[PDB]
Amino acid sequence: KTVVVTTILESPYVMMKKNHEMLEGNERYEGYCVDLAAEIAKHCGFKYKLTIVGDGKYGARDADTKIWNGMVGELVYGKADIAIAPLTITLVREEVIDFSKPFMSLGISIMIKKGTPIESAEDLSKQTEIAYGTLDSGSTKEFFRRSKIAVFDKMWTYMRSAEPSVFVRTTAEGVARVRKSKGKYAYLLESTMNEYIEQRKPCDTMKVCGNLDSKGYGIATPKGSSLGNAVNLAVLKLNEQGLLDKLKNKWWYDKGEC
Amino acid sequence: KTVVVTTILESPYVMMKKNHEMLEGNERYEGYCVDLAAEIAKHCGFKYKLTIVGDGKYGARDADTKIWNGMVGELVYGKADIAIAPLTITLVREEVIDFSKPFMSLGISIMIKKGTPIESAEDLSKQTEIAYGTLDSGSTKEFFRRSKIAVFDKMWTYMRSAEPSVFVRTTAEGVARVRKSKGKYAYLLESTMNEYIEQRKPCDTMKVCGNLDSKGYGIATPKGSSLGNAVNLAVLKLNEQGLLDKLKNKWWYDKGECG
Ligand SMILES: N[C@@H](CCC(=O)O)C(=O)O
Ligand SMILES: N[C@@H](CCC(=O)O)C(=O)O
Structure with missing residues (x-):
């Protein structure tokens, strides 16, 4: 079926186009992470829908209730198949989701x-x-x-x-x-x-x-996901081909103003 | 009559156009400093010739001989009327040439x-x-x-x-x-x-x-020259109207090629 990609409005990873009110579906959004999703979906050959995490959060675990919010929660509780976002790989998140090899360092x-x-x-x-x-x-x-x-x-x-x-x-x-x-x-x-x-x-x-x-940031999938391996390989290939560097140049430095 | 402008080939201040071999005179060159000279010559109304410093150097003083080379030397010994280049304002150069206010910081x-x-x-x-x-x-x-x-x-x-x-x-x-x-x-x-x-x-x-x-970079002229004041007066006015910022944008970021 179609892959549900959760992500978050964070420039320049995902931004609304100026005239998004006249556009539909994945075309409403642009950015580094929008381009990466397009490429990963090509190398993995799946169809996808971009969705914005409803609570607008990355992901953290409530200490009293041990419940996850944000993009992590979407993966853990089954509202999305994959998170494509500036999502930081950490040991605690690694307990409940799977991360790809990093696509970016920070x-x-x-x-x-x-x-x-x-x-x-x-x-x-x-x-x-x-x-x-x-x-x-x-x-x-x-x-x-x-x-x-x-x-x-x-x-x-x-x-x-x-x-x-x-x-x-x-x-x-x-x-x-x-x-x-x-x-x-x-x-x-x-x-x-x-x-x-x-x-x-x-x-x-x-x-x-x-x-x-x-x-580093990684692409995240749920534990057990059949998608986990193809996305890891898609990340490594796009890094070999220099595409990750080009997108970083495309969205950060090409458009500078200072 | 014609003002001799010394400068140096340094991208994106001064560059040969792709098709410079089909052109002559000041039309062979493009860049930030080329635009600045064209504009400065407008607000002061003089005609100019762009020349590339012959020794290809910015300017230094020989310790033993006290003689300047490069664009600084062209101004000190009267081979040029004005240097328009990414020429750094420095104290030792100020002893012997006149600098405008900075037109750019670095x-x-x-x-x-x-x-x-x-x-x-x-x-x-x-x-x-x-x-x-x-x-x-x-x-x-x-x-x-x-x-x-x-x-x-x-x-x-x-x-x-x-x-x-x-x-x-x-x-x-x-x-x-x-x-x-x-x-x-x-x-x-x-x-x-x-x-x-x-x-x-x-x-x-x-x-x-x-x-x-x-x-900072400054426009340089020779010591005492009347052109120094006329050209500084042009420098600050055009920044107030953004001319410097437009050229900075026009020549730096517009021209990325890595995404
Ligand atoms: N990348 C961070 C969000 C940004 C931040 O925490 O400063 C995360 O995945 O939680
Ligand atoms: N602007 C320098 C040249 C560049 C450099 O030294 O790195 C000068 O005026 O000598």
């Missing part, structure tokens, strides 16, 4: 307003005038929640107890908060997105050099 | 082959398997020669004594050397040029995060 990173005196997480941790936060339900929050490294536990400790909340619900809200804070808010986010925002107008944010960690 | 940067394990200039300084070098007679060489920062001084000492020479005569030679070295050569160059090349075919180069310094 690390947690810092975004500041051009001008802000910050060069590192250690600078952030040792001061208080500049507030910092993360997206409210992703691998970046969890990295800090679970870190045993002193700088990062201190940062998590400050972030969990800050009033008002330093967490945001969307990358766009975090970026907006950086722009509006006169250099008084730094946004902790993945380097691929930090890089994308850096080269878009109004060109007032900067990505601090040096990531806090190093990891 | 920093020293690092170019590697996609794959190379280098994350910073400090990383370069601490190892031996990967060679690095600069253009042989410009501000980037002098920045390193003169730096009181330990890493950059460690880098100059390695570069000057390295065998074979890690220095190159043209930006293109430095870029070619990166591609041909399987990640065994890193090229230290200015950020505007590194960024343009990164998104040009064959798309096998990368710019390390973080510039090593911050400085």
